[PDB]
Every structure is written in C-alpha cells, then in structure tokens.
Design a protein around this motif. Structure first.
Motif, PDB file in Angstrom:
ATOM      1  N   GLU A   1      18.391  13.059  14.959  1.00 39.35           N
ATOM      2  CA  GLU A   1      18.463  14.236  14.098  1.00 39.35           C
ATOM      3  C   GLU A   1      19.032  13.814  12.744  1.00 39.35           C
ATOM      4  OE1 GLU A   1      19.471  18.031  15.518  1.00 39.35           O
ATOM      5  OE2 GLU A   1      21.121  18.486  14.106  1.00 39.35           O
ATOM      6  N   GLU A   2      19.891  12.805  12.751  1.00 38.12           N
ATOM      7  CA  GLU A   2      20.503  12.342  11.524  1.00 38.12           C
ATOM      8  C   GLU A   2      19.734  11.277  10.751  1.00 38.12           C
ATOM      9  OE1 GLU A   2      24.577  13.673  11.328  1.00 38.12           O
ATOM     10  OE2 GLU A   2      25.200  11.578  11.127  1.00 38.12           O
ATOM     11  N   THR A   3      19.009  10.364  11.399  1.00 39.90           N
ATOM     12  CA  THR A   3      18.352   9.353  10.601  1.00 39.90           C
ATOM     13  C   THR A   3      17.273  10.030   9.849  1.00 39.90           C
ATOM     14  OG1 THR A   3      16.496   8.688  11.932  1.00 39.90           O
ATOM     15  CG2 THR A   3      18.700   7.689  12.450  1.00 39.90           C
ATOM     16  N   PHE A   4      16.757  11.108  10.440  1.00 36.33           N
ATOM     17  CA  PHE A   4      15.734  11.881   9.742  1.00 36.33           C
ATOM     18  C   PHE A   4      16.297  12.692   8.589  1.00 36.33           C
ATOM     19  CE2 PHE A   4      13.298  11.206  13.736  1.00 36.33           C
ATOM     20  CZ  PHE A   4      12.513  10.220  13.193  1.00 36.33           C
TER      21      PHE A   4
ATOM     22  N   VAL B   1       0.811  -1.197   0.000  1.00 37.94           N
ATOM     23  CA  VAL B   1       0.000   0.000   0.000  1.00 37.94           C
ATOM     24  C   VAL B   1       0.844   1.245   0.000  1.00 37.94           C
ATOM     25  CG1 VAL B   1      -1.688   1.313   1.176  1.00 37.94           C
ATOM     26  CG2 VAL B   1      -1.725  -1.166   1.229  1.00 37.94           C
ATOM     27  N   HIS B   2       1.854   1.258   0.857  1.00 39.31           N
ATOM     28  CA  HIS B   2       2.753   2.393   0.932  1.00 39.31           C
ATOM     29  C   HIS B   2       4.021   1.739   0.525  1.00 39.31           C
ATOM     30  CE1 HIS B   2      -0.386   3.663   3.804  1.00 39.31           C
ATOM     31  NE2 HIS B   2      -0.192   4.785   3.138  1.00 39.31           N
ATOM     32  N   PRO B   3       4.445   1.982  -0.714  1.00 38.52           N
ATOM     33  CA  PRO B   3       5.675   1.420  -1.297  1.00 38.52           C
ATOM     34  C   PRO B   3       6.887   2.353  -1.242  1.00 38.52           C
ATOM     35  CG  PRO B   3       4.308   2.225  -3.064  1.00 38.52           C
ATOM     36  CD  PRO B   3       3.524   2.471  -1.761  1.00 38.52           C
ATOM     37  N   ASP B   4       6.654   3.544  -0.704  1.00 36.36           N
ATOM     38  CA  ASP B   4       7.681   4.582  -0.561  1.00 36.36           C
ATOM     39  C   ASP B   4       8.228   4.672   0.858  1.00 36.36           C
ATOM     40  OD1 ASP B   4       4.897   5.388  -0.189  1.00 36.36           O
ATOM     41  OD2 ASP B   4       5.311   7.496  -0.662  1.00 36.36           O
ATOM     42  N   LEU B   5       7.675   3.866   1.761  1.00 34.41           N
ATOM     43  CA  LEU B   5       8.109   3.915   3.124  1.00 34.41           C
ATOM     44  C   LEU B   5       9.562   3.632   3.268  1.00 34.41           C
ATOM     45  CD1 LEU B   5       6.861   1.218   2.577  1.00 34.41           C
ATOM     46  CD2 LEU B   5       8.622   0.653   4.097  1.00 34.41           C
ATOM     47  N   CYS B   6      10.023   3.930   4.480  1.00 36.23           N
ATOM     48  CA  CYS B   6      11.376   3.682   4.947  1.00 36.23           C
ATOM     49  C   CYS B   6      11.167   2.813   6.204  1.00 36.23           C
ATOM     50  CB  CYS B   6      12.112   4.992   5.268  1.00 36.23           C
ATOM     51  SG  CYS B   6      11.130   6.226   6.110  1.00 36.23           S
ATOM     52  N   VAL B   7      12.227   2.166   6.663  1.00 35.57           N
ATOM     53  CA  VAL B   7      12.166   1.303   7.823  1.00 35.57           C
ATOM     54  C   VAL B   7      13.346   1.711   8.742  1.00 35.57           C
ATOM     55  CG1 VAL B   7      11.934  -1.123   8.485  1.00 35.57           C
ATOM     56  CG2 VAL B   7      11.632  -0.560   6.145  1.00 35.57           C
ATOM     57  N   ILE B   8      13.041   2.158   9.967  1.00 31.93           N
ATOM     58  CA  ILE B   8      14.039   2.502  10.996  1.00 31.93           C
ATOM     59  C   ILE B   8      13.993   1.264  11.885  1.00 31.93           C
ATOM     60  CG2 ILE B   8      14.532   3.956  13.056  1.00 31.93           C
ATOM     61  CD1 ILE B   8      13.231   6.327  11.411  1.00 31.93           C
ATOM     62  N   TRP B   9      15.036   0.448  11.814  1.00 29.37           N
ATOM     63  CA  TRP B   9      15.120  -0.821  12.546  1.00 29.37           C
ATOM     64  C   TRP B   9      15.968  -0.740  13.838  1.00 29.37           C
ATOM     65  CZ3 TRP B   9      13.232  -5.377   9.700  1.00 29.37           C
ATOM     66  CH2 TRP B   9      13.605  -6.627  10.247  1.00 29.37           C
ATOM     67  N   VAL B  10      15.262  -0.602  14.971  1.00 25.95           N
ATOM     68  CA  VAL B  10      15.843  -0.515  16.329  1.00 25.95           C
ATOM     69  C   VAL B  10      15.955  -1.957  16.847  1.00 25.95           C
ATOM     70  CG1 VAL B  10      15.476   0.402  18.697  1.00 25.95           C
ATOM     71  CG2 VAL B  10      14.850   1.799  16.754  1.00 25.95           C
ATOM     72  N   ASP B  11      17.143  -2.532  16.727  1.00 24.02           N
ATOM     73  CA  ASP B  11      17.388  -3.925  17.123  1.00 24.02           C
ATOM     74  C   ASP B  11      18.838  -3.911  17.605  1.00 24.02           C
ATOM     75  OD1 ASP B  11      17.670  -6.840  16.953  1.00 24.02           O
ATOM     76  OD2 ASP B  11      16.150  -6.798  15.358  1.00 24.02           O
TER      77      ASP B  11
ATOM     78  N   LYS C   1       9.057  13.629   2.363  1.00 25.08           N
ATOM     79  CA  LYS C   1       8.453  13.060   3.538  1.00 25.08           C
ATOM     80  C   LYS C   1       7.732  11.786   3.086  1.00 25.08           C
ATOM     81  CE  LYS C   1       9.917  16.546   5.830  1.00 25.08           C
ATOM     82  NZ  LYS C   1      10.993  16.988   4.876  1.00 25.08           N
ATOM     83  N   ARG C   2       7.933  10.693   3.797  1.00 23.31           N
ATOM     84  CA  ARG C   2       7.283   9.458   3.425  1.00 23.31           C
ATOM     85  C   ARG C   2       6.876   8.644   4.657  1.00 23.31           C
ATOM     86  NH1 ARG C   2      11.881   5.896   1.645  1.00 23.31           N
ATOM     87  NH2 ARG C   2      13.819   6.977   2.177  1.00 23.31           N
ATOM     88  N   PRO C   3       5.893   7.727   4.513  1.00 18.61           N
ATOM     89  CA  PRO C   3       5.435   6.905   5.657  1.00 18.61           C
ATOM     90  C   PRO C   3       6.588   6.198   6.345  1.00 18.61           C
ATOM     91  CG  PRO C   3       4.077   6.542   3.726  1.00 18.61           C
ATOM     92  CD  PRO C   3       5.328   7.232   3.236  1.00 18.61           C
TER      93      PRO C   3
END
Ligand SMILES: [Mn+2]
Ligand SMILES: [Mn+2]
Ligand SMILES: [Mn+2]
Lengths: 303, 303, 303
Positions: free
Chosen positions: C208-211, C109-119, C219-221
């Motif tokens: 501040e940087e990952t953004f 549905v949202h193919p432009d998203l990004c993934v911030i993976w906190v692991d 701007k994306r989901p």
C-alpha cells in the motif's frame, strides 16, 4: 453441551485410499481420550458401517454416485439424531463428501445454521462443471438452495434437500479454485477470504469479519467443516490434495479458539486425514497431531 | 555501554544434561568475537564455577534446592557487580533457573527495572503448585514481591529478596502454561501476549504495547530474559522443552531490534540452549546460530 | 499486452555455476506453456547467445567486466526493442547483473518507469566499495543517476547511461546489507522496506505504501526485478546466496498479484535461479516451482 463423536470413514468421494482410516488414526492419537478432559461430556458413536451398492456405475462424468449417496443418507439421519438429542456432532471423516451428510443432518434440526468452510478449495463443482468426477469436490454444490437443478439430479442424492444458501456460507483459506467454481462463488455472491485476503488483513480481521457477516443479523448455530488440506502441507502433509502456501498451524488454531469463543459451535467436521499419503510416519504423526489440537481447540483448549 | 559476558552453565534446574554446555556452544559459535564488532565494548568474565552442595536432598516436591540456590547467589553478586560498574550484563546459561540470580543481581543496582520475559512458558510455578520438582520452571515464582511466602521457603533461596512485582513483568510468546501458573498470572494481573495475542495483532503491535505498558509511566532499565525455547522448534530445536507453533526467526529478531532501539536494555539472558538435545549437528548449528543473532540484534545489528 | 520472453542465461556476474541454466529450468517447468493460458499473448525470443571476450582480465577489484558488459549491451538493445514494439519484457536470468541490461533496455523506451526491487540484498555496491568483485551485486550501482562517476568507469559499461534516480526505486525484503550499501541507500535517501518493516506492517501495508510513494505523483510503467533469493530459502533454496528469514511463498505472491493489479507492469525479471545449488531435485523442484507462480501471478493468476 455433550459431544457425540461419529466416525464416517470413506474414500469413495475421491480415487485414493486410506482416507477411511483417518478416523482410527485420530482415535489412536488419543482424540476422544484427550477430549474427555474438557469441560465437555464425550459420547463415542463409533464408526458408521457404509452400505456399498454393488455396481453403482458412474453417472455421466461422476464416479460412485450410488455408493456415496447411500453412504451420506445414513450419516444424515445419524447426525440429525445427535442434534435432536441436544448434542454437538463431530464427524471424523473420510472424504469431504461427508459434509453433505453432516450438514443435511445438522440442518434438519438446526435449519438456521451457517457454515464456515476452512478448506483450500471451494469444493463447490456441479456434476456438470466437474472435471474430476470425484464427488469429494462437489459437496457444497449439492447443499446450496441457490444451485438447485443446475446440474442433473445425481442418482442417490434425491433424499438431499438443498440445505443452505450462498448467504449463510463463508470460505476461509482458499488458494486452489477451479475456474467454474470461481464462476459460481463469484457470480453467486459467496463471501470468502482466500489466502490473499488473509495476507492483506491477517486471520485477526478475517475472523472479526466472518462473524460480523454471519452472526451479524442474529446469533445462530455454527457448523464448521475443517478440511485438514487447508493448513500448510508442512503441517498436514498427509492429505490427498495439498496445495502450498496455506494457513499455518498458528492460524488454524486461531480459527478454532474464536469459533470456540463464540459459544455457538453445534457442529464440526475433521475431514480429509489420509494416513497413507504421508511419506514416513513423522509426516503422519504430524498431520494427526495437528488435526487433533484443532478439534480440542474448538472445545476449550487455549494457550 | 560496555557488555560483560557472564557464562552461567547449569543443568540442575531441570533433569536433562548438556545445558551447561550452552555457553561454550555460543562462544564457539563466535558470539563474543562477533559482538566485539558492534559500537559496544566487550569484556568476557568467562564461565562461573558452580559450588555443588554434596547431598542437598530434594525439599518437598522440589529437587536440587541447595545446589541451585547456592549456584544463583554467586551469579547474583557477580551481576550486581557488573551493573554497579556501569555495564550491561549478558548471561549465557544454563537453565532458566539462572534468571533468579541474573535479576536479583540486576535489581540490586537497578531496582526500577522491568522484565520482558520471551519464553513459551510462564516459568512461574510455586514450590507448592509445581508438578515437576524442577526449579527451572519456578524462577518467576521466586522473584515476585506479590507471591512472597506463598510457597514455603525453599532451602538456600533465603538470600533472595522478592525482586519485582506483577506490574513490572510482561510475557511474550506464551503457549504452554500449566493451570496453576494460569491461576497465578491471570489472578495476579500479569500482563502478557501469548501466541494467540501475537496472532490477533502481530509482534508489531505486541511490542508497541508492551512498551506503552512498561515504559509508559517512566523510562526505566530493561531486563530481557530470552528463553530460546519460545522461538519455533524448526529454528531452535536443541532445547529441553519445545512446544510447537511459537514465534519465528523473523519475530524473535523484531523483538530484539525494538528492545535494542529503546536504548534501555541494561540486562539480557540467552537461556536454555542445550547442545545435546539436537538430533544431528545441523539442528544444533541451527539453534546456536539463531541464538546468536538475537544477542547481536539486541546490540546494534539491523537488516 | 503481449509478453516476449527473453532468456538471459549468465553466471559471469558471480563465481558459481549453473545460473545460466536457470532459464531452461523454468521453461522445462512449463513456464511459457503455462503463460500462454492467460489473457496475455506469449512470444518466445529464446535464449540470447552471450559474447565472451577472451581475456577480459579483472578491472581493479572487479572480475569479468568486459565479459559482463558486452553481455548486457546485447540484452539492452534486445529489451529496448520488445518495449518499442509495445510488449512487456520478461527476462529469465542469469545473475542479477542482467538487471543493468534489462533496465537500460526498458528505460530507453519508457524512461519514466520506476523499479520495485524484491531482493534480500540491496545489490548496490560501487566498483569501489565492492568486497566481492562480483558484479552481480553492483547492478543498481551502475544504474543510478545519483552515483555517476562515484566509482571509476568499469571497462565495457560505457554504453550504460545512468538510468534512474534514487527517487524511482524501492527495495522490498532486504535483510543482508553490506555497510557501504547501507551508507549509500541510507545517505542517498532510497526508500525501502527490509524484513523488519515488513514485520512491523505486513506486506499489506508495505505494498500500500510503495505504491503511494512511486505511483503517487503520476501513474508510470513498472519494472520489477524479482531476485528469487529474497523469498525464504525453505521455498527457493536453489540460489547462490540465501539469507534466512525472508519473505514467504504467500508474501511473494501478494507482491505479484498487487503489481499485476495495478495494470502498469511493463517489465519483469526472474533472476537468480541456480539449478545446481539445490542439494536434491526436490529442493530444485521447489525453487523452480515457486519461481514460476510468481511469474504467472504477475500475469493474471489469482487464488
Ligand atoms: Mn480441500
Ligand atoms: Mn521455556
Ligand atoms: Mn540477492
């Protein structure tokens, strides 16, 4: 230059016990004894004896008003004395309701002071918005010129004159605020640094900024009410209301060495140590022990 | 390029035992075994056998001078060897008195080195100002050109030539300094970052600065004496003298990955692990375990 | 604007049990109940019922491929729904293998998203380089356009279309990476902030940087997969794979309040809570409890 040590043992501000044993806990720990050894001169007023009004039946949604109010007034005029006689008061409490006495007391003599309030809570709920009748979370509400007659006059707090405005108070370490309080602090304009701010800039700047705010215009006496509950519970677990993720033992000290370093601390409160909420002695030995170096840190001890 | 691992087990520097078991503790932990797996080549000298002078009766207010001194000399000429043969020495101690041997040893071959001393104490008390005769807190005192003949010559430390000045040494993590030591470090001009400095700038800058100080003028070999006591006791509890509120496991590592990253670490000491001061194995399994990643971190291991 | 809460209980991704009880643990904790009280509207899909293929015998060095793959597909088309119907999905897992379903689902549905993976781990091992067959550490490997056909097609992951590239994914909190994974992430160009980076700049800048990296161009989901294992085990001890020295409870929250604050979080995963790896309830009460404020923090709760 000389410190008077008052003992203001009191539980009436909240519903748990042992809080009035906090002062004896820190004296047994060797506070006054370890304080004598600074460049400062230590007098020991001992613990005040709080007048307990018989049946001072709860007023509206607020318990023990007549017992707490009378109880502060005595404190007030004891602090206004020490100050007058040119000494720095240190109040070992007791609930954080003792700040009403401690500040009215400090403010009569030094009426230009500011208050840097290191607590996990705003402790600013008006007898109106209070959920938990407990006055120990209404101190600031009572001592703010900007909130006068914004909550019906509590019985026995009439001697109380709205000491201080929203512009001479800063909060550090906030992380557990009630909506109403947020409504007040946010709508009243009260400057502050909650845990997130501390996270974004680190105490280094936090401090660099509370000073550029408060002592900016003019240098003035500093009153600091350290609520032992705003350190992390790993450190001061023996408290009545512990929220997680607070300041650390290193951070607490950094606050104290800086306030010390300014040379304007004319008043301090080591509020909230409850020696009976600590599952095990170690936990208690931990709270008392860290409560004490914050006191000493404010009086010269460096690293 | 190749690491020689010396084992310098020794308790004589202070009055508690088991400290000489520290090296076996870390080898049992798989140090050398886990070190082999880096880009580096590991030789294992084994543990030195320390000559114990019969009745080397305490000199003035300083215990065991003849046993410690003889004990370092052997170390010195063992380290001056490894260095000469172009390898990086790693001394698994032992009291922090083993730094006198380790550095004289490192400095004979590389006389331009600097020493970044990560400890909770300055460990810089002259046989004069010493309270606790224990030499384990006088190492730096013995190895500083600027303090020569400022404390009567201790017996058996004559082989010792004032290695290093106040301008080639930095302390990180200080938080428990004796007055006299402060008198020295402060009056001698010794650069340093105690816990408060770390608090005001965070290891990120702390490190950025010790490098702009030491390696500023010229790049030179780095000798790093990590005293396991300057991490927080929550991490390395199994030590002889733990002060609270130190560096953290994350901070310790950040020191090691940076020093590693410079490419000039020609010498390291993993001093103070006492496997008998740890109430419980877990506490010990915790000290040893965190002692080891600091070693490995200095040799390539990243995250 | 409305949150759908999916429950994706699953252990098959790794060899320990109880992980599928993670969702009930957080619901019992009052998640949905405490979520209702935000400015958001909460629907509760309940827990999916995972189809278990009989004898889906391990493929090469990778266990349970047919059971995990089928198990994700259902998730995928459940998430692609919620999204389609204009809502924000919250997947309470379950292994971190559930990210394959969760993201393919979000990305249709949202193919432009990004993934911030906190692991604490990259969780990016190809069925080739995998040591531990466990797919729970291969999620990212499966969802990366840049690694397509770089590991023989696992059976039952054919429905999977290489969602996302190396330029729309960031890792925060890394500290336990396998060589191969480092080979990938480092050679693939994947931006990230492991513990050391966090140490050198503090989450303040990290964020501040990952953004300025991800939301920079447009701007994306935002899809955020929080693996509860990357906080410090002192906080979330009840996990399957805990490495020491991670983020702190304060840091975790700072991530969530910022991602919240952007106003683009369209998807979140609270993966890895294992209520049976916690020696004692307290440890469990601690993991669940801190898992929940991260969820709530992402939905409005401030301090
Ligand atoms: Mn409080
Ligand atoms: Mn030390
Ligand atoms: Mn993980």
């Amino acid at each position: 230059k000389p410190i008077e040590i008052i003992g203001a043992p009191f539980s009436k501000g909240q519903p748990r016990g042992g809080v009035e044993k906090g002062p004896a806990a820190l004296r047994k720990a060797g506070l006054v004894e370890k304080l004598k050894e600074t460049e400062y001169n230590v007098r020991d007023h001992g613990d005040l004896a709080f007048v307990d009004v018989p049946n001072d039946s709860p007023f509206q949604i607020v318990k023990n008003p007549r017992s707490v109010g009378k109880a502060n007034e005595q404190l007030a005029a004891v602090v206004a004395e020490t100050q007058k006689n040119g000494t720095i008061s240190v109040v070992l409490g007791g609930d954080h309701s003792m700040a009403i006495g401690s500040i009215s007391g400090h403010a009569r003599v030094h009426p230009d002071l500011c208050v840097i309030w290191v607590d996990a809570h705003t402790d600013i709920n008006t007898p109106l918005t209070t959920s938990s009748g407990n006055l120990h979370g209404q101190p600031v509400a009572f001592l703010l010129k900007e909130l006068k007659g914004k909550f019906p006059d509590v019985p026995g707090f009439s001697w109380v004159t709205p000491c201080i405005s929203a512009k001479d108070i800063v909060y550090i370490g906030l992380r557990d605020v009630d909506p109403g309080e947020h409504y007040i602090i946010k709508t009243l304009g009260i400057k502050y640094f909650s845990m997130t701010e501390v996270d974004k800039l680190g105490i280094g700047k936090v401090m660099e900024e509370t000073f550029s705010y408060l002592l900016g215009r003019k240098k003035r006496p500093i009153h600091l009410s350290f609520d032992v509950d705003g350190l992390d519970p790993v450190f001061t677990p023996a408290t009545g209301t512990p929220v997680v993720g607070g300041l650390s033992y290193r951070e607490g000290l950094y606050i104290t060495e800086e306030i010390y370093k300014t040379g304007l601390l004319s008043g301090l409160d080591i509020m909230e140590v409850n020696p009976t909420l600590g599952k095990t002695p170690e936990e208690v030995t931990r709270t008392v022990n860290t409560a004490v170096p914050l006191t000493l840190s404010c009086f010269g001890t460096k690293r």
